Design a protein around this motif. Structure first.
Motif, PDB file in Angstrom:
ATOM      1  N   UNK A  51      68.974 138.812   4.997  1.00 36.72           N
ATOM      2  CA  UNK A  51      68.819 137.509   5.622  1.00 36.72           C
ATOM      3  C   UNK A  51      69.806 136.481   5.047  1.00 36.72           C
ATOM      4  N   UNK A  52      70.673 135.982   5.924  1.00 42.43           N
ATOM      5  CA  UNK A  52      71.705 135.026   5.553  1.00 42.43           C
ATOM      6  C   UNK A  52      71.565 133.641   6.146  1.00 42.43           C
ATOM      7  N   UNK A  53      71.988 132.661   5.355  1.00 42.95           N
ATOM      8  CA  UNK A  53      71.998 131.271   5.764  1.00 42.95           C
ATOM      9  C   UNK A  53      73.468 131.006   5.573  1.00 42.95           C
ATOM     10  N   UNK A  54      73.811 129.986   4.798  1.00 42.93           N
ATOM     11  CA  UNK A  54      75.220 129.731   4.534  1.00 42.93           C
ATOM     12  C   UNK A  54      75.589 130.928   3.678  1.00 42.93           C
ATOM     13  N   UNK A  55      74.675 131.255   2.771  1.00 39.25           N
ATOM     14  CA  UNK A  55      74.840 132.379   1.874  1.00 39.25           C
ATOM     15  C   UNK A  55      73.519 133.141   1.891  1.00 39.25           C
ATOM     16  N   UNK A  56      73.548 134.403   1.467  1.00 41.35           N
ATOM     17  CA  UNK A  56      72.357 135.247   1.439  1.00 41.35           C
ATOM     18  C   UNK A  56      71.111 134.530   0.926  1.00 41.35           C
ATOM     19  N   UNK A  57      69.961 134.949   1.438  1.00 42.31           N
ATOM     20  CA  UNK A  57      68.701 134.341   1.054  1.00 42.31           C
ATOM     21  C   UNK A  57      67.516 135.319   1.213  1.00 42.31           C
ATOM     22  N   UNK A  66      62.878 129.248   4.136  1.00 41.80           N
ATOM     23  CA  UNK A  66      62.806 127.998   3.390  1.00 41.80           C
ATOM     24  C   UNK A  66      63.928 127.774   2.374  1.00 41.80           C
ATOM     25  N   UNK A  67      64.561 128.852   1.904  1.00 43.37           N
ATOM     26  CA  UNK A  67      65.643 128.718   0.924  1.00 43.37           C
ATOM     27  C   UNK A  67      66.876 128.087   1.542  1.00 43.37           C
ATOM     28  N   UNK A  68      67.139 128.414   2.801  1.00 43.40           N
ATOM     29  CA  UNK A  68      68.296 127.876   3.502  1.00 43.40           C
ATOM     30  C   UNK A  68      68.337 126.346   3.412  1.00 43.40           C
ATOM     31  N   UNK A 103      68.781 128.689  11.740  1.00 45.13           N
ATOM     32  CA  UNK A 103      68.638 128.639  10.286  1.00 45.13           C
ATOM     33  C   UNK A 103      69.203 129.866   9.575  1.00 45.13           C
ATOM     34  N   UNK A 104      68.695 131.049   9.892  1.00 44.52           N
ATOM     35  CA  UNK A 104      69.201 132.253   9.257  1.00 44.52           C
ATOM     36  C   UNK A 104      69.634 133.213  10.344  1.00 44.52           C
ATOM     37  N   UNK A 106      62.002 131.495  12.831  1.00 44.86           N
ATOM     38  CA  UNK A 106      62.411 130.152  12.413  1.00 44.86           C
ATOM     39  C   UNK A 106      61.456 129.265  11.606  1.00 44.86           C
ATOM     40  N   UNK A 107      60.228 129.099  12.084  1.00 47.50           N
ATOM     41  CA  UNK A 107      59.282 128.209  11.414  1.00 47.50           C
ATOM     42  C   UNK A 107      58.393 128.778  10.313  1.00 47.50           C
ATOM     43  N   UNK A 108      58.774 129.918   9.739  1.00 47.13           N
ATOM     44  CA  UNK A 108      57.981 130.506   8.652  1.00 47.13           C
ATOM     45  C   UNK A 108      58.459 129.902   7.333  1.00 47.13           C
ATOM     46  N   UNK A 109      59.626 130.338   6.885  1.00 42.45           N
ATOM     47  CA  UNK A 109      60.166 129.801   5.662  1.00 42.45           C
ATOM     48  C   UNK A 109      59.525 130.336   4.409  1.00 42.45           C
TER      49      UNK A 109
END
Ligand SMILES: [Mg+2]
Ligand SMILES: [Mg+2]
Length: 678
Positions: free
Chosen positions: A317-323, A327-329, A458-459, A636-639
DNA sequence: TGAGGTAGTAGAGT
RNA sequence: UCACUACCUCG
């Protein structure tokens, strides 16, 4: 990556020659039945006939000699008499392999089990469930511990026992007594004298010993005649209805009914409501009950079945960078970004952005590609037209989503607001006013919601799978789509989008609504990825019949795109236990040939695996599950935790629940890429 | 309206 | 199987 597991399943002795070929019997009725009352009758014939006998298509089958069977008699049904006559026709070979031939040997099996449980003593037997322990108590209600059972025949021609611990909730009060001491009227109710249930409409004031029934015979007198008033005290009149025509009110006595309780245990003189169990405690309890039941079944010692499991690769799972979680994103930056404009509407006591929330977003965006702009809504909803004025301007000023700070609202109002704003083209997220920035998870999720509605991805999933497009279908009418429903898709970056079936007033051709949904989906995709999916993954709750997907599966067939149709059920995969060692996420357990189990999650109780069926396509189960499992993280809305079902299904589920209580009309311009329903 | 999991209710008239 | 409610859960 192999591993092996334990199913809440136990093998027993194979079906001896006798059991191998049941007795078959012809069935003659009088007066002639129908075509709608025919089958609902046979099932009754086999019952009055007695023994271990079941309906086998036209007539009935049996593991009992025609000697013990009452080969001739009568039977009533809704005030209509009938006369039957059974004729043995010798026997007929049967097949354990054959889909259909099995189904019979299994029905006999449940009946075999059914008769054994009924002769057990000191136990509360309800159907195939067996209850035997005092667990909780309280003002006349008691929660008993027990197990839900099932016996069927396998491919091999052996017995299979299925066991899974469960709690039953019993009221040893009676409507009258229940109400008589400060309790609301239950939705459902049950006869004190037998096992049937009804829907409790309303209490009556008519006099019980005066109210006449078909005939003239008194309501009271009717029951008393049958002895079910002895030792009881039938109080007031109560009106109920049959779960076939919940419209025709029937008279009944409150003293002869028992409330159908439902987790309204409002005291504990026996224990806490912890009705759940940890995986090796229940496993232990399973092995036991199974050993016991098998003990008095006389089918031999129960052998727990080992099964072949595979460990699926963890998703990246990636955002700007791996996550890890979404919620980390909010600190690592988002996957795809750019200027979004979020407006704030406050419906409580003050004026600005709670400091933290402002810094939270700023950092999130600062952490992701571009930056944001944050407006405030000057008008309050009560200002009527004034409000919409500021709104229609802020919709132009860029604002793609609104964050609402307000005290809890009765859903009566909560809907009004969302509706208005939405018809105005503004998705909205609510967050209850008494808020302290101690509650990270709460506002953090609220924020994740805003951005999903704002229209941000988000991710995303780092990689490629067999299907570029996965679309999930959900219907609003548990039975089918003749009343609508929605769909949600993901695939690609990975951009997710929803779709809605245009508004109808009556019933629509079930299988047309589905094609309606799939095509709209493919258009939004084409127009968003510029490509047309080589292959699609279609997910459904297997709630609805499989033929409602006919038009679409043939539609895709004429477009040149290949698909796989998979049905996902949340109930019925039983349990899965680790032989030795602990279990991990993404455990893939293949079973009977087009089916498998997926333990998408764990990290309290016992994981309830998903049971999926490949109803169409040709890609291998392995690749199917791998993908479905991965789709588990795109919500999306878990985080702070991943759902059990794949994002597309989980999304459609919550989009069908929104259109339901908001008003499909107002869904005017709402971009099909801004998940306003989350 | 934070949200997810598990866990129960369930869909021969009177 | 939806809403329901309870309980946590949130490294
Ligand atoms: Mg659904
Ligand atoms: Mg929400």
């Amino acid at each position: 990556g192999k591993t092996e597991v334990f199913l809440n399943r136990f093998a027993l002795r194979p079906l001896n020659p006798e059991e191998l070929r049941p007795w078959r019997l012809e069935v003659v009725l009088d007066p002639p039945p129908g075509r709608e009352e025919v089958y609902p009758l046979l099932a009754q014939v086999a019952r009055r006939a007695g023994g271990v006998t079941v309906r086998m298509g036209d007539g009935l089958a049996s593991w009992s000699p025609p000697e013990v069977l009452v080969l001739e008699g009568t039977l009533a049904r809704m005030g209509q008499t009938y006369a039957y006559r059974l004729y043995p026709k010798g026997r007929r070979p049967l097949d354990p392999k054959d889909p259909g031939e099995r189904s019979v040997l299994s029905a006999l099996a449940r009946r075999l089990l059914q008769e054994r449980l009924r002769r057990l003593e000191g136990v509360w037997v309800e159907g195939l469930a067996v209850y035997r322990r005092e667990h909780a108590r309280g003002p006349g209600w008691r929660v008993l511990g027990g197990a839900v059972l099932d016996l069927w025949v396998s491919d091999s021609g052996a017995f299979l026992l299925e066991v899974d611990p469960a709690y039953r909730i019993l009221c040893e009060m009676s409507l009258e007594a229940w109400l008589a001491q400060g309790h609301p009227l239950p939705k459902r109710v049950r006869n004190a004298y037998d096992r049937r249930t009804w829907e409790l409409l309303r209490l009556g004031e008519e006099d019980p010993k005066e109210l006449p029934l078909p005939g003239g015979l008194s309501l009271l007198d009717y029951h008393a005649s049958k002895g079910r008033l002895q030792g009881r005290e039938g109080g007031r009149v109560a009106w109920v209805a049959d779960p076939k025509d919940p419209r025709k009110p029937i008279p009944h006595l409150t003293g002869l009914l028992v409330p159908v309780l439902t987790l309204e245990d409002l005291h504990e003189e026996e224990g806490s409501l912890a009705l759940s169990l940890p995986w090796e405690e229940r496993r232990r309890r399973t092995r036991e009950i199974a050993s016991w039941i098998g003990r008095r079944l006389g089918l031999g010692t129960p052998e727990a079945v080992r099964a072949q499991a595979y460990r699926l690769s963890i998703p990246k799972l990636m955002g700007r960078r791996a996550v890890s979680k979404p919620a980390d994103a909010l600190r690592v930056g988002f996957y795809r970004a750019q200027e979004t404009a979020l407006a704030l509407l406050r419906l409580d006591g003050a004026q600005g952005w709670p400091e933290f929330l402002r810094r939270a977003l700023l950092r999130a965006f600062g952490a992701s590609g571009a930056s944001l702009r944050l407006h405030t809504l000057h008008a309050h909803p009560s200002q009527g037209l004034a409000f919409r004025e500021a709104l229609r301007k802020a919709k132009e000023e860029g604002v793609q989503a609104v964050l609402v700070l307000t005290p809890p609202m009765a859903w009566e109002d909560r809907n009004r607001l969302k509706a208005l704003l939405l018809r105005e083209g503004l998705p909205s997220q609510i967050l209850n006013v008494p808020l302290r920035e101690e509650e990270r998870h709460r506002w953090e999720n609220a924020l994740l919601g805003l951005l999903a509605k704002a229209g941000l991805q988000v991710v995303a999933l780092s990689g490629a799978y067999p299907a570029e497009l996965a679309v999930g279908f959900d219907a609003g009418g548990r039975e089918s789509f003749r009343f609508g429903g929605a769909a949600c898709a993901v695939g690609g970056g990975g951009h997710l989008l929803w779709t809605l079936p245009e508004a109808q007033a009556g019933e629509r051709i079930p299988q047309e609504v589905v094609w309606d949904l799939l095509e709209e989906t493919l258009w939004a995709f084409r127009r968003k990825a510029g490509r047309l999916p080589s292959r699609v993954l279609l997910l459904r709750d297997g709630r609805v019949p499989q033929d409602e997907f006919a038009l679409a599966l043939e539609a895709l067939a004429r477009e040149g795109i290949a698909y796989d149709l998979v049905s996902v059920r949340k109930s019925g995969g039983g349990r899965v236990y680790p032989v030795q060692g602990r279990l991990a996420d993404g455990l893939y357990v293949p079973l009977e040939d087009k089916t498998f189990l997926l333990l998408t999650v764990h990290r309290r109780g016992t994981p309830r695996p998903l049971k999926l069926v490949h109803e169409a396509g040709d890609t291998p189960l392995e690749a199917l599950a791998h993908q479905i499992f991965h789709l588990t993280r795109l919500y999306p809305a878990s985080g702070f935790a991943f759902p059990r079902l794949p994002a597309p299904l989980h999304l459609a589920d919550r989009l069908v629940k929104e259109v339901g209580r908001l008003g499909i009309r107002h869904l005017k311009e709402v971009d099909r890429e801004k998940l306003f329903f989350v």
